[PDB]
Amino acid sequence: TEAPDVDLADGNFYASREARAAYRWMRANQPVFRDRNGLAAASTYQAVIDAERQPELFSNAGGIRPDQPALPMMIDMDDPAHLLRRKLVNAGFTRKRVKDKEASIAALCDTLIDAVCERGECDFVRDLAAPLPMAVIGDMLGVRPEQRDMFLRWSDDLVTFLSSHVSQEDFQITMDAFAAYNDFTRATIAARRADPTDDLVSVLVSSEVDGERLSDDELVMETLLILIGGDETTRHTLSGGTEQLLRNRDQWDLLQRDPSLLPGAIEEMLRWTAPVKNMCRVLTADTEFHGTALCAGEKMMLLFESANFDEAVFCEPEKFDVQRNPNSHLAFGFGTHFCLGNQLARLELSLMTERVLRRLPDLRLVADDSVLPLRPANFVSGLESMPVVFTPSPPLG
């Protein structure tokens, strides 16, 4: 009955395997919780949904990180301006455009598995989970394969900034990474304005809504939002979700014998892993919210992992169950800002997992999860490393 002594802006909290016990106390005793520094956080599924449904009170226009200002990106915007920006960028994310990527994503999955399959061991994080989303989003943005690692480095630097209160040295690194991304992207824009192709910048250049188009400034900001979504999130559901399949081998075995269970497995991997641990909302007025007094101008976190483990919604939430129905998890949020990339992320998860199951059918963890660390970060986090072993096989291509 004593509250957990926690700092919800500290990345070390999210790397602890005790975070879920802290969330459990919040949900049972103070659903809109204030941490040791007074930062407010919605911990229950009900409170998160209710805040998501009230964007005029719980605004994104102060920025979605604690103690960082808004950027001119759709995720830091409110309607009506947000709705126009999202409609413009949606040209890249129509259901048909995303579903048509299936063969190309599958090819990348097979190339990555081909690189390890003869060895009998790999680091699942380094060799499969991190590179696959990077290659997909890189290919959309025109990145040469041998330059993916450079983009991944810029992205890891940007997410480090989003995930902490950086030193001056890490602030400078962040500004350098943006400057390099800006240069590359404005070069792509200029090339595609002169010679359109069918890549993401081409589709976004030509997108038009209510007589409006995206400016070059907006194209840089929106493709940067997409890059980071495309290379810093899905990786952690691939690793951590596969980790749960290997820890609970009855679950691995169900999927291997029935491919039609894969869609529900991907949803359970998303629920469990919740790579995005929080998004902030700024209060536009003083308000009494699920029992807690909130003040105009402060930021409240939405705790999506906590909501995904709320017993009021998910029976036995600490049981990983690929068959779980319903599974209305909040890994992608809810409402006006619901992840634009959700279909792409689900497709990448599906195509890689189906190939892991079939091509590495006896996959096992080298050492159990108790020695596998999570990355300290207050925004997006998952496994650092996941050594796995399997019976070798020959490549496909």
Ligand code: HEM
């Ligand atoms: C498992 C992978 C991913 C997770 C967990 C995730 C999570 C989220 C969350 C939580 C939000 C905010 C929702 C809210 O506050 O209610 C969001 C927004 C967004 N995501 Fe993702 N994301 C993922 C992958 C991606 C990818 C792959 C892309 C693009 C290729 C992407 C693009 C976006 C965009 C553009 C927004 C802003 C939408 C808006 O503000 O209207 N995301 N995502």
Ligand SMILES: CCOC(=O)c1cc2cc(-c3ccncc3)ccc2[nH]1
């Ligand atoms: C340091 C400047 O900031 C950015 O470069 C930035 C990128 C970015 C991406 C997300 C995101 C994207 C898609 N899906 C979930 C989250 C959120 C905040 C972000 N900030």
Ligand SMILES: [Br-]
């Ligand atoms: Br706005």
Ligand SMILES: [Br-]
């Ligand atoms: Br579809």
Ligand SMILES: [Br-]
């Ligand atoms: Br594209």
Ligand SMILES: [Br-]
């Ligand atoms: Br069954």
